[PDB]
Amino acid sequence: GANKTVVVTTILESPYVMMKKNHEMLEGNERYEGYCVDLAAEIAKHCGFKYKLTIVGDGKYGARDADTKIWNGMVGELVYGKADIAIAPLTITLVREEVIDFSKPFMSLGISIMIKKGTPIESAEDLSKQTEIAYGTLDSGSTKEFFRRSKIAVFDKMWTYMRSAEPSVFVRTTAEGVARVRKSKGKYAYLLESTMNEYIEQRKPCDTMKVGGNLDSKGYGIATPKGSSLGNAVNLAVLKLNEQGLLDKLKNKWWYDKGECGS
Amino acid sequence: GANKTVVVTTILESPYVMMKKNHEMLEGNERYEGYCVDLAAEIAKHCGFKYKLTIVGDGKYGARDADTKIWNGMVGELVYGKADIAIAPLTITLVREEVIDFSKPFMSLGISIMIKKGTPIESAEDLSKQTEIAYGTLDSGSTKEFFRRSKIAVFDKMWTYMRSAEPSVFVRTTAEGVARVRKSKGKYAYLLESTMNEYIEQRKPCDTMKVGGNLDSKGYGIATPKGSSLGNAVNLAVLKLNEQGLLDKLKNKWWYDKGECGS
Numbered sequence: 257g258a259n260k261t262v263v264v265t266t267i268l269e270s271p272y273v274m275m276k277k278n279h280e281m282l283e284g285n286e287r288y289e290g291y292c293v294d295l296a297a298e299i300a301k302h303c304g305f306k307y308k309l310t311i312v313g314d315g316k317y318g319a320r321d322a323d324t325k326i327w328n329g330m331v332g333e334l335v336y337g338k339a340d341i342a343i344a345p346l347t348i349t350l351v352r353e354e355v356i357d358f359s360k361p362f363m364s365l366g367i368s369i370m371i372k373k374g375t376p377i378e379s380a381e382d383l384s385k386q387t388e389i390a391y392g393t394l395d396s397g398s399t400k401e402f403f404r405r406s407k408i409a410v411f412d413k414m415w416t417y418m419r420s421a422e423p424s425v426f427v428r429t430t431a432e433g434v435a436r437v438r439k440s441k442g443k444y445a446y447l448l449e450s451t452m453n454e455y456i457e458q459r460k461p462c463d464t465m466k467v468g469g470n471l472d473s474k475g476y477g478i479a480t481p482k483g484s485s486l487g488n489a490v491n492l493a494v495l496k497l498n499e500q501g502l503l504d505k506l507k508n509k510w511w512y513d514k515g516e517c518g519s
Numbered sequence: 520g521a522n523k524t525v526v527v528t529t530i531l532e533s534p535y536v537m538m539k540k541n542h543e544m545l546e547g548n549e550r551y552e553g554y555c556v557d558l559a560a561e562i563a564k565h566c567g568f569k570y571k572l573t574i575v576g577d578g579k580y581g582a583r584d585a586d587t588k589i590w591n592g593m594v595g596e597l598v599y600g601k602a603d604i605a606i607a608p609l610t611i612t613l614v615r616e617e618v619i620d621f622s623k624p625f626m627s628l629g630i631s632i633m634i635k636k637g638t639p640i641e642s643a644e645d646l647s648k649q650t651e652i653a654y655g656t657l658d659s660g661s662t663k664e665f666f667r668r669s670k671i672a673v674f675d676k677m678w679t680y681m682r683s684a685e686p687s688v689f690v691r692t693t694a695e696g697v698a699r700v701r702k703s704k705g706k707y708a709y710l711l712e713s714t715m716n717e718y719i720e721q722r723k724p725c726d727t728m729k730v731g732g733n734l735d736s737k738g739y740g741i742a743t744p745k746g747s748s749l750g751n752a753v754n755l756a757v758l759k760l761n762e763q764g765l766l767d768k769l770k771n772k773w774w775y776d777k778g779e780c781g782s
């Protein structure tokens with residue numbers, strides 16, 4: 257049949273996808289800006305398709321309910337045919353790979369520790385051995401699931417701590433986690449993807465930093481429904497953009513070129 | 520039909536695949552040791568297959584001759600049906616992805632600079648601006664091809680330098696590049712994959728180091744013939760091993776646990 261406009265699912269998460277300041281004056285894809293907005297346009301240009309950016313209805317990345325077996329988030333939108341492609345900071349994981357297709361990574365990263373400057377923590381092991389400095393994750397997504405599923409002693413101990421700590425150490429959004437670090441006088445450390453930690457470190461008021469090495473290594477991938485014809489071309493586009501240096505330029509654009517915390 | 524033993528193609532490259540010191544006493548897969556030997560065994564265990572390690576006949580990773588259109592190296596062995604899987608430090612690239620299937624990365628890396636300690640170089644830009652300190656790559660493989668194909672100004676200038684420099688700045692093997700760094704009194708710098716640079720930095724006589732950031736970001740993948748049924752299971756195995764922390768343990772085993780240059 258004739259070509260159709262490709263439905264892209266994504267999520268509002270700075271600096272990946274944001275509504276422009278003047279969005280009310282604008283329409284369609286032009287209402288949005290960010291790393292993933294630019295990436296979507298580059299992929300579409302390379303693959304020769306028209307597309308529509310849509311925002312995932314339930315605000316989630318993607319997980320399967322153990323009782324109903326239903327997939328939520330952007331993964332669910334692909335699984336159930338509501339979107340054709342997901343372009344977002346979506347981690348490639350085994351359980352997702354079983355149900356959707358993923359490109360090779362467009363960004364390599366790991367779980368990391370964000371502290372308020374001056375907090376006496378240098379590693380996950382440091383956090384695990386104490387409780388005075390509380391620590392936690394988003395309440396949904398691959399960072400939380402890493403701890404929940406880990407059989408590594410330090411990370412299992414951290415998960416047991418997080419489930420039992422009071423008040424709750426979980427946050428609903430990145431913005432809430434960052435604000436909690438900033439307002440807690442050194443008594444909250446936030447576990448988050450290194451990409452995001454690096455971005456926030458270059459935002460005013462310049463009071464956070466990434467400490468220690470990453471806890472894992474992984475990647476974000478562009479996702480399509482399993483077996484979708486679009487997957488091959490999208491994957492080749494990711495590889496081409498990487499090989500041309502354009503993914504590095506895009507990260508610099510959104511993370512560092514207008515960083516707010518000096519040079 | 521009945522299950523058959525899987526033919527693995529690999530390449531002798533320390534610390535990925537090496538003949539054991541006592542190999543003449545041994546037979547079959549047990550003659551070999553290294554990171555990729557251990558990885559092959561883990562993948563086979565997870566996927567439930569028996570396998571035979573074989574060494575690529577032509578000693579190459581994989582490229583296509585522009586005139587004959589023939590693929591060489593491990594890629595060629597897959598393309599032409601001589602092997603079922605390649606398990607090696609094989610870079611995921613666009614041109615290879617078009618002809619073979621790749622798992623998600625089992626190791627993330629980039630091109631990097633190896634210097635003899637004390638060489639006054641900190642970046643690729645530093646190298647590009649001078650000729651007193653000669654610099655080059657392997658004479659085959661993805662590092663060489665990165666420079667040959669680059670449209671980035673610094674790297675294009677470096678390639679033009681490398682093609683025209685005398686004596687030849689290219690080397691046939693990693694061992695030759697390392698020996699050339701070590702014997703050239705600071706007047707040769709070697710461009711190589713960061714993984715390998717990190718390994719050599721922990722080998723006696725402890726006279727080399729990695730300097731500067733990496734020039735690119737990419738990954739090694741397990742490769743199978745395009746459309747091979749084995750690809751799905753192998754990819755899931757890579758993701759599982761990564762998520763369990765086993766790939767990190769394997770790198771530590773072969774790079775750092777018995778490093779020769781201190782703690």
Ligand SMILES: N[C@@H](Cn1c2c(c(=O)[nH]c1=O)COC2)C(=O)O
Binds near residue numbers: 317394396
């Ligand atoms: N990438 C994750 C979602 N996620 C995200 C951030 C984080 O600190 N931890 C996560 O789990 C920051 O941006 C997204 C997924 O795919 O579930």
Ligand SMILES: N[C@@H](Cn1c2c(c(=O)[nH]c1=O)COC2)C(=O)O
Binds near residue numbers: 659
């Ligand atoms: N990974 C490359 C081959 N390669 C390799 C090393 C290097 O410094 N540069 C390369 O090009 C070290 O070990 C392999 C390929 O797949 O062609």
Ligand SMILES: [Cl-]
Binds near residue numbers: 259
């Ligand atoms: Cl349409």
Ligand SMILES: [Cl-]
Binds near residue numbers: 522523524
């Ligand atoms: Cl057989």
Ligand SMILES: [Li+]
Binds near residue numbers: 354355356357358
């Ligand atoms: Li998948």
Ligand SMILES: [Li+]
Binds near residue numbers: 615616618619621745
């Ligand atoms: Li491929």
